[PDB]
Amino acid sequence: PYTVVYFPVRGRCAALRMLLADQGQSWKEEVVTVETWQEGSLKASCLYGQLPKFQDGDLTLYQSNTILRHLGRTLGLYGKDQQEAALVDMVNDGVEDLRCKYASLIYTNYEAGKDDYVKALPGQLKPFETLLSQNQGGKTFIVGDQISFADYNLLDLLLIHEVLAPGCLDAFPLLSAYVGRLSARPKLKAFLASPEYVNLPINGNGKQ
Amino acid sequence: PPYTVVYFPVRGRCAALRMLLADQGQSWKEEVVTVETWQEGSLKASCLYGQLPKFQDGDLTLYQSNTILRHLGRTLGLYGKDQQEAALVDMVNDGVEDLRCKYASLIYTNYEAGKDDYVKALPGQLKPFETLLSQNQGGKTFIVGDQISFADYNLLDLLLIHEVLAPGCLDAFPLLSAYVGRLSARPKLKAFLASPEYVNLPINGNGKQ
Ligand SMILES: N[C@@H](CCC(=O)N[C@@H](CS)C(=O)NCC(=O)O)C(=O)O
Ligand SMILES: N[C@@H](CCC(=O)N[C@@H](CS)C(=O)NCC(=O)O)C(=O)O
Ligand SMILES: O=[N+]([O-])c1ccc(SCCCCCCO)c2nonc12
Ligand SMILES: O=[N+]([O-])c1ccc(SCCCCCCO)c2nonc12
């Protein structure tokens, strides 16, 4: 069984939660309040002084993308071969890059930086549209014909950007259809509709 | 060679993967991209995320430095002995990437104003890797398990460039210090690090270090 240790926010656990839900995996949520975190003891015990912390039986992991890659590896969501595995990494690293830019905006420069960020957004999303266009016309997944951890990470990136800049996918038919298609997967649909997801803020500072 | 590295004339985000290839006795081609060629725009427009490095393994074209590291890691058997070790290797590399991003931000956006604060924060940033070494065979081997991983090469570069930025930063970290000496002494890697191919490239693209 799995345990997710995190703040009461979607943030960097959103993608891995979607993965677990869609894959019909059970997990426990250990919700850490800001007050508990500010006490200091849990933070000091964390490898890089940060969350998420993740438990897979006796194995304890840190780093959101390590968790995603671990679940991808152990559950067979990492491409069909080494070639696809490399492409999956390439997508995920791209998602991470834009997530970092997004987080920087949200937490450090929302008011002054939003206009420039949204203006630059089309150019940041186009690589993912291009990737879909080059994989079976964008009719399946981001890499190959089976779902990967990168799909869940990209899906979250796209969902949070729809909130930040409504209509940001309108120019991108493959990304638009991809979001709708993945979101309609029965277990994922149910999770995305649940208060467990809906009633958490996207970020920790009330900005989105 | 089956491998091609496409990059600016700098060490930067290719240093670790080059060390990996050299230490593993692999052949590769270097394709150098000048400031002018980059400013022209055509190569940049053709890159997936508009950035370098670009890497070729036969007809497989990759972008993203850590994607290249993981690809070489998997293919050359530098990704742990099993699934659990693979996760630990990823955990290390993600930590290295996190600090590398902070390093790059200092170098390229805020060197003069940010250096003092960065160097003050540095011991707290390096400590986790010392901790990991201490919990793995007393720090006498590698960062994860008893065989070298792509994370070792990435960590090694991170440590080398930080010793240039903050001389003596590893004085506080005996295991990290010995680790750098040990890995740097690996014969193929030692030869590569001493070679014009490595030495005559700057660490960064703006002449800061
Ligand atoms: N590279 C890390 C970063 C994790 C991170 O930024 N953690 C934040 C929340 S998403 C945190 O624990 N902030 C609290 C702190 O640093 O004190 C990952 O992917 O997990
Ligand atoms: N996430 C990327 C970052 C790549 C990157 O920041 N590339 C820089 C050189 S290291 C670049 O191409 N800058 C030129 C530009 O953006 O025009 C990776 O790991 O490869
Ligand atoms: O992915 N992030 O950069 C990130 C996620 C979540 C949060 S919310 C964490 C709330 C706990 C309070 C401590 C904030 O440093 C972040 N705060 O600064 N960067 C954050
Ligand atoms: O890893 N980096 O963030 C990074 C590496 C190398 C460089 S140097 C690239 C030189 C090309 C610049 C050409 C000027 O139009 C970085 N510049 O900004 N971030 C950089």
mmCIF file with all atom_site columns, N, CA, C and O and ligand atoms in Angstrom, chain A residues 6-7 9-13 37 43 46 48-53 62-67 96 99-100 103 107, chain B residues 94-95 98, ligand 1:
data_model
loop_
_atom_site.group_PDB
_atom_site.id
_atom_site.type_symbol
_atom_site.label_atom_id
_atom_site.label_alt_id
_atom_site.label_comp_id
_atom_site.label_asym_id
_atom_site.label_entity_id
_atom_site.label_seq_id
_atom_site.pdbx_PDB_ins_code
_atom_site.Cartn_x
_atom_site.Cartn_y
_atom_site.Cartn_z
_atom_site.occupancy
_atom_site.B_iso_or_equiv
_atom_site.pdbx_formal_charge
_atom_site.auth_seq_id
_atom_site.auth_comp_id
_atom_site.auth_asym_id
_atom_site.auth_atom_id
_atom_site.pdbx_PDB_model_num
ATOM   1   N N   . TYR A 1 6   ? 1.672  15.156 2.276   1.00 0.00 ? 6   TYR A N   1
ATOM   2   C CA  . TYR A 1 6   ? 1.644  16.466 1.613   1.00 0.00 ? 6   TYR A CA  1
ATOM   3   C C   . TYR A 1 6   ? 0.753  17.484 2.319   1.00 0.00 ? 6   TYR A C   1
ATOM   4   O O   . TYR A 1 6   ? -0.056 17.131 3.182   1.00 0.00 ? 6   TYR A O   1
ATOM   5   N N   . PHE A 1 7   ? 0.915  18.749 1.939   1.00 0.00 ? 7   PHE A N   1
ATOM   6   C CA  . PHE A 1 7   ? 0.023  19.829 2.362   1.00 0.00 ? 7   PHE A CA  1
ATOM   7   C C   . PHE A 1 7   ? -1.372 19.645 1.742   1.00 0.00 ? 7   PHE A C   1
ATOM   8   O O   . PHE A 1 7   ? -1.505 18.947 0.729   1.00 0.00 ? 7   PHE A O   1
ATOM   9   N N   . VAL A 1 9   ? -3.134 20.590 -0.534  1.00 0.00 ? 9   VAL A N   1
ATOM   10  C CA  . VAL A 1 9   ? -3.111 21.263 -1.830  1.00 0.00 ? 9   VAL A CA  1
ATOM   11  C C   . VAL A 1 9   ? -2.892 20.229 -2.922  1.00 0.00 ? 9   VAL A C   1
ATOM   12  O O   . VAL A 1 9   ? -2.385 19.128 -2.673  1.00 0.00 ? 9   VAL A O   1
ATOM   13  N N   . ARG A 1 10  ? -3.329 20.567 -4.135  1.00 0.00 ? 10  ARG A N   1
ATOM   14  C CA  . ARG A 1 10  ? -3.119 19.695 -5.293  1.00 0.00 ? 10  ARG A CA  1
ATOM   15  C C   . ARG A 1 10  ? -1.628 19.718 -5.655  1.00 0.00 ? 10  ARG A C   1
ATOM   16  O O   . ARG A 1 10  ? -0.930 18.710 -5.496  1.00 0.00 ? 10  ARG A O   1
ATOM   17  N N   . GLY A 1 11  ? -1.152 20.873 -6.118  1.00 0.00 ? 11  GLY A N   1
ATOM   18  C CA  . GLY A 1 11  ? 0.279  21.122 -6.349  1.00 0.00 ? 11  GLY A CA  1
ATOM   19  C C   . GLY A 1 11  ? 1.037  19.994 -7.026  1.00 0.00 ? 11  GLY A C   1
ATOM   20  O O   . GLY A 1 11  ? 0.623  19.500 -8.078  1.00 0.00 ? 11  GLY A O   1
ATOM   21  N N   . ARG A 1 12  ? 2.137  19.576 -6.399  1.00 0.00 ? 12  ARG A N   1
ATOM   22  C CA  . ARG A 1 12  ? 3.034  18.565 -6.967  1.00 0.00 ? 12  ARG A CA  1
ATOM   23  C C   . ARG A 1 12  ? 2.627  17.113 -6.684  1.00 0.00 ? 12  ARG A C   1
ATOM   24  O O   . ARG A 1 12  ? 3.355  16.184 -7.029  1.00 0.00 ? 12  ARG A O   1
ATOM   25  N N   . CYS A 1 13  ? 1.459  16.926 -6.074  1.00 0.00 ? 13  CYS A N   1
ATOM   26  C CA  . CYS A 1 13  ? 0.897  15.592 -5.859  1.00 0.00 ? 13  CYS A CA  1
ATOM   27  C C   . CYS A 1 13  ? -0.294 15.310 -6.767  1.00 0.00 ? 13  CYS A C   1
ATOM   28  O O   . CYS A 1 13  ? -0.786 14.182 -6.817  1.00 0.00 ? 13  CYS A O   1
ATOM   29  N N   . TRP A 1 37  ? 3.883  21.842 9.834   1.00 0.00 ? 37  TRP A N   1
ATOM   30  C CA  . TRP A 1 37  ? 5.114  22.015 9.064   1.00 0.00 ? 37  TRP A CA  1
ATOM   31  C C   . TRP A 1 37  ? 6.035  23.062 9.686   1.00 0.00 ? 37  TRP A C   1
ATOM   32  O O   . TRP A 1 37  ? 7.248  22.858 9.768   1.00 0.00 ? 37  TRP A O   1
ATOM   33  N N   . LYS A 1 43  ? 9.874  18.466 8.630   1.00 0.00 ? 43  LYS A N   1
ATOM   34  C CA  . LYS A 1 43  ? 10.753 19.108 7.646   1.00 0.00 ? 43  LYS A CA  1
ATOM   35  C C   . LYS A 1 43  ? 12.212 18.675 7.791   1.00 0.00 ? 43  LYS A C   1
ATOM   36  O O   . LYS A 1 43  ? 12.853 18.296 6.808   1.00 0.00 ? 43  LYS A O   1
ATOM   37  N N   . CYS A 1 46  ? 12.916 15.249 6.413   1.00 0.00 ? 46  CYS A N   1
ATOM   38  C CA  . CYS A 1 46  ? 12.788 15.089 4.959   1.00 0.00 ? 46  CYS A CA  1
ATOM   39  C C   . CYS A 1 46  ? 14.133 15.269 4.270   1.00 0.00 ? 46  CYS A C   1
ATOM   40  O O   . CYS A 1 46  ? 14.888 16.179 4.612   1.00 0.00 ? 46  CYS A O   1
ATOM   41  N N   . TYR A 1 48  ? 15.311 16.444 1.420   1.00 0.00 ? 48  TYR A N   1
ATOM   42  C CA  . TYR A 1 48  ? 15.609 17.774 0.898   1.00 0.00 ? 48  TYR A CA  1
ATOM   43  C C   . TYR A 1 48  ? 14.789 18.855 1.616   1.00 0.00 ? 48  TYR A C   1
ATOM   44  O O   . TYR A 1 48  ? 14.602 19.956 1.090   1.00 0.00 ? 48  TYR A O   1
ATOM   45  N N   . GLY A 1 49  ? 14.309 18.526 2.817   1.00 0.00 ? 49  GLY A N   1
ATOM   46  C CA  . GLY A 1 49  ? 13.523 19.449 3.643   1.00 0.00 ? 49  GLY A CA  1
ATOM   47  C C   . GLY A 1 49  ? 12.185 19.851 3.041   1.00 0.00 ? 49  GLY A C   1
ATOM   48  O O   . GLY A 1 49  ? 11.634 20.901 3.386   1.00 0.00 ? 49  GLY A O   1
ATOM   49  N N   . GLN A 1 50  ? 11.660 19.013 2.147   1.00 0.00 ? 50  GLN A N   1
ATOM   50  C CA  . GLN A 1 50  ? 10.443 19.333 1.401   1.00 0.00 ? 50  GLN A CA  1
ATOM   51  C C   . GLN A 1 50  ? 9.490  18.148 1.231   1.00 0.00 ? 50  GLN A C   1
ATOM   52  O O   . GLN A 1 50  ? 9.867  16.988 1.437   1.00 0.00 ? 50  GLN A O   1
ATOM   53  N N   . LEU A 1 51  ? 8.247  18.466 0.871   1.00 0.00 ? 51  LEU A N   1
ATOM   54  C CA  . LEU A 1 51  ? 7.243  17.475 0.503   1.00 0.00 ? 51  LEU A CA  1
ATOM   55  C C   . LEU A 1 51  ? 6.958  17.599 -1.003  1.00 0.00 ? 51  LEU A C   1
ATOM   56  O O   . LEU A 1 51  ? 7.266  18.634 -1.599  1.00 0.00 ? 51  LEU A O   1
ATOM   57  N N   . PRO A 1 52  ? 6.361  16.564 -1.629  1.00 0.00 ? 52  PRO A N   1
ATOM   58  C CA  . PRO A 1 52  ? 5.817  15.323 -1.071  1.00 0.00 ? 52  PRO A CA  1
ATOM   59  C C   . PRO A 1 52  ? 6.844  14.325 -0.535  1.00 0.00 ? 52  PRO A C   1
ATOM   60  O O   . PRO A 1 52  ? 7.983  14.259 -1.013  1.00 0.00 ? 52  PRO A O   1
ATOM   61  N N   . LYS A 1 53  ? 6.405  13.578 0.472   1.00 0.00 ? 53  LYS A N   1
ATOM   62  C CA  . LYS A 1 53  ? 7.068  12.371 0.945   1.00 0.00 ? 53  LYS A CA  1
ATOM   63  C C   . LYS A 1 53  ? 6.136  11.219 0.568   1.00 0.00 ? 53  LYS A C   1
ATOM   64  O O   . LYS A 1 53  ? 4.912  11.357 0.639   1.00 0.00 ? 53  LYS A O   1
ATOM   65  N N   . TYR A 1 62  ? 11.286 10.710 -1.799  1.00 0.00 ? 62  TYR A N   1
ATOM   66  C CA  . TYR A 1 62  ? 11.042 12.141 -1.913  1.00 0.00 ? 62  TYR A CA  1
ATOM   67  C C   . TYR A 1 62  ? 11.208 12.502 -3.381  1.00 0.00 ? 62  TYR A C   1
ATOM   68  O O   . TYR A 1 62  ? 11.721 11.691 -4.159  1.00 0.00 ? 62  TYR A O   1
ATOM   69  N N   . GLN A 1 63  ? 10.772 13.710 -3.741  1.00 0.00 ? 63  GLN A N   1
ATOM   70  C CA  . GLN A 1 63  ? 10.801 14.232 -5.118  1.00 0.00 ? 63  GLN A CA  1
ATOM   71  C C   . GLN A 1 63  ? 9.618  13.736 -5.950  1.00 0.00 ? 63  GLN A C   1
ATOM   72  O O   . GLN A 1 63  ? 9.503  12.544 -6.231  1.00 0.00 ? 63  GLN A O   1
ATOM   73  N N   . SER A 1 64  ? 8.746  14.668 -6.340  1.00 0.00 ? 64  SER A N   1
ATOM   74  C CA  . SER A 1 64  ? 7.510  14.344 -7.066  1.00 0.00 ? 64  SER A CA  1
ATOM   75  C C   . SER A 1 64  ? 7.737  13.520 -8.337  1.00 0.00 ? 64  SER A C   1
ATOM   76  O O   . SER A 1 64  ? 6.989  12.581 -8.608  1.00 0.00 ? 64  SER A O   1
ATOM   77  N N   . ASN A 1 65  ? 8.770  13.867 -9.104  1.00 0.00 ? 65  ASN A N   1
ATOM   78  C CA  . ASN A 1 65  ? 9.075  13.136 -10.336 1.00 0.00 ? 65  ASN A CA  1
ATOM   79  C C   . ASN A 1 65  ? 9.712  11.769 -10.105 1.00 0.00 ? 65  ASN A C   1
ATOM   80  O O   . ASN A 1 65  ? 9.575  10.875 -10.938 1.00 0.00 ? 65  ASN A O   1
ATOM   81  N N   . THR A 1 66  ? 10.409 11.615 -8.980  1.00 0.00 ? 66  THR A N   1
ATOM   82  C CA  . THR A 1 66  ? 10.883 10.300 -8.541  1.00 0.00 ? 66  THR A CA  1
ATOM   83  C C   . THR A 1 66  ? 9.690  9.385  -8.240  1.00 0.00 ? 66  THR A C   1
ATOM   84  O O   . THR A 1 66  ? 9.679  8.219  -8.641  1.00 0.00 ? 66  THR A O   1
ATOM   85  N N   . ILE A 1 67  ? 8.688  9.928  -7.550  1.00 0.00 ? 67  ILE A N   1
ATOM   86  C CA  . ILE A 1 67  ? 7.462  9.185  -7.246  1.00 0.00 ? 67  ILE A CA  1
ATOM   87  C C   . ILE A 1 67  ? 6.754  8.755  -8.538  1.00 0.00 ? 67  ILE A C   1
ATOM   88  O O   . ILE A 1 67  ? 6.382  7.589  -8.689  1.00 0.00 ? 67  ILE A O   1
ATOM   89  N N   . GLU A 1 96  ? 7.905  19.366 -16.358 1.00 0.00 ? 96  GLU A N   1
ATOM   90  C CA  . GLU A 1 96  ? 8.579  19.898 -15.169 1.00 0.00 ? 96  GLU A CA  1
ATOM   91  C C   . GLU A 1 96  ? 9.084  21.331 -15.376 1.00 0.00 ? 96  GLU A C   1
ATOM   92  O O   . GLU A 1 96  ? 8.886  22.186 -14.513 1.00 0.00 ? 96  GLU A O   1
ATOM   93  N N   . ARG A 1 99  ? 6.144  23.601 -15.349 1.00 0.00 ? 99  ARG A N   1
ATOM   94  C CA  . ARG A 1 99  ? 5.626  23.601 -13.973 1.00 0.00 ? 99  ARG A CA  1
ATOM   95  C C   . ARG A 1 99  ? 6.445  24.526 -13.070 1.00 0.00 ? 99  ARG A C   1
ATOM   96  O O   . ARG A 1 99  ? 5.884  25.240 -12.239 1.00 0.00 ? 99  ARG A O   1
ATOM   97  N N   . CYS A 1 100 ? 7.767  24.511 -13.240 1.00 0.00 ? 100 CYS A N   1
ATOM   98  C CA  . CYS A 1 100 ? 8.647  25.393 -12.470 1.00 0.00 ? 100 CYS A CA  1
ATOM   99  C C   . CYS A 1 100 ? 8.368  26.865 -12.767 1.00 0.00 ? 100 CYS A C   1
ATOM   100 O O   . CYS A 1 100 ? 8.338  27.693 -11.851 1.00 0.00 ? 100 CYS A O   1
ATOM   101 N N   . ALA A 1 103 ? 4.974  27.658 -11.130 1.00 0.00 ? 103 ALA A N   1
ATOM   102 C CA  . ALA A 1 103 ? 5.153  27.809 -9.684  1.00 0.00 ? 103 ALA A CA  1
ATOM   103 C C   . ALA A 1 103 ? 5.842  29.129 -9.327  1.00 0.00 ? 103 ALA A C   1
ATOM   104 O O   . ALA A 1 103 ? 5.456  29.796 -8.365  1.00 0.00 ? 103 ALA A O   1
ATOM   105 N N   . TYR A 1 107 ? 3.916  31.796 -6.912  1.00 0.00 ? 107 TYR A N   1
ATOM   106 C CA  . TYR A 1 107 ? 4.425  32.037 -5.561  1.00 0.00 ? 107 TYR A CA  1
ATOM   107 C C   . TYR A 1 107 ? 5.314  33.269 -5.395  1.00 0.00 ? 107 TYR A C   1
ATOM   108 O O   . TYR A 1 107 ? 5.503  33.740 -4.271  1.00 0.00 ? 107 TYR A O   1
ATOM   109 N N   . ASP B 2 94  ? 17.090 14.126 -9.195  1.00 0.00 ? 94  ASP B N   1
ATOM   110 C CA  . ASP B 2 94  ? 16.128 15.222 -9.023  1.00 0.00 ? 94  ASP B CA  1
ATOM   111 C C   . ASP B 2 94  ? 16.644 16.280 -8.042  1.00 0.00 ? 94  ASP B C   1
ATOM   112 O O   . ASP B 2 94  ? 16.452 17.481 -8.258  1.00 0.00 ? 94  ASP B O   1
ATOM   113 N N   . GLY B 2 95  ? 17.303 15.827 -6.973  1.00 0.00 ? 95  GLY B N   1
ATOM   114 C CA  . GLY B 2 95  ? 17.946 16.732 -6.017  1.00 0.00 ? 95  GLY B CA  1
ATOM   115 C C   . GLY B 2 95  ? 19.079 17.520 -6.654  1.00 0.00 ? 95  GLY B C   1
ATOM   116 O O   . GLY B 2 95  ? 19.208 18.724 -6.432  1.00 0.00 ? 95  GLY B O   1
ATOM   117 N N   . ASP B 2 98  ? 17.541 20.145 -8.964  1.00 0.00 ? 98  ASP B N   1
ATOM   118 C CA  . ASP B 2 98  ? 17.035 21.256 -8.147  1.00 0.00 ? 98  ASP B CA  1
ATOM   119 C C   . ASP B 2 98  ? 18.132 22.271 -7.804  1.00 0.00 ? 98  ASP B C   1
ATOM   120 O O   . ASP B 2 98  ? 17.941 23.481 -7.974  1.00 0.00 ? 98  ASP B O   1
HETATM 121 N N1  . LIG C 3 .   ? 11.740 19.092 -6.602  1.00 0.00 ? 1   LIG C N1  1
HETATM 122 C C1  . LIG C 3 .   ? 10.774 18.895 -5.573  1.00 0.00 ? 1   LIG C C1  1
HETATM 123 C C2  . LIG C 3 .   ? 10.254 20.169 -4.927  1.00 0.00 ? 1   LIG C C2  1
HETATM 124 C C3  . LIG C 3 .   ? 9.267  19.982 -3.783  1.00 0.00 ? 1   LIG C C3  1
HETATM 125 C C4  . LIG C 3 .   ? 8.743  21.287 -3.222  1.00 0.00 ? 1   LIG C C4  1
HETATM 126 O O1  . LIG C 3 .   ? 8.964  22.473 -3.846  1.00 0.00 ? 1   LIG C O1  1
HETATM 127 N N2  . LIG C 3 .   ? 8.096  21.198 -2.097  1.00 0.00 ? 1   LIG C N2  1
HETATM 128 C C5  . LIG C 3 .   ? 7.356  22.272 -1.525  1.00 0.00 ? 1   LIG C C5  1
HETATM 129 C C6  . LIG C 3 .   ? 5.872  22.110 -1.762  1.00 0.00 ? 1   LIG C C6  1
HETATM 130 S S1  . LIG C 3 .   ? 5.430  21.666 -3.467  1.00 0.00 ? 1   LIG C S1  1
HETATM 131 C C7  . LIG C 3 .   ? 7.642  22.361 -0.051  1.00 0.00 ? 1   LIG C C7  1
HETATM 132 O O2  . LIG C 3 .   ? 7.768  21.216 0.641   1.00 0.00 ? 1   LIG C O2  1
HETATM 133 N N3  . LIG C 3 .   ? 7.703  23.553 0.470   1.00 0.00 ? 1   LIG C N3  1
HETATM 134 C C8  . LIG C 3 .   ? 8.018  23.669 1.890   1.00 0.00 ? 1   LIG C C8  1
HETATM 135 C C9  . LIG C 3 .   ? 9.414  24.055 2.321   1.00 0.00 ? 1   LIG C C9  1
HETATM 136 O O3  . LIG C 3 .   ? 10.320 24.112 1.520   1.00 0.00 ? 1   LIG C O3  1
HETATM 137 O O4  . LIG C 3 .   ? 9.558  24.355 3.478   1.00 0.00 ? 1   LIG C O4  1
HETATM 138 C C10 . LIG C 3 .   ? 9.673  17.948 -5.981  1.00 0.00 ? 1   LIG C C10 1
HETATM 139 O O5  . LIG C 3 .   ? 9.453  17.798 -7.147  1.00 0.00 ? 1   LIG C O5  1
HETATM 140 O O6  . LIG C 3 .   ? 9.055  17.329 -5.183  1.00 0.00 ? 1   LIG C O6  1
#
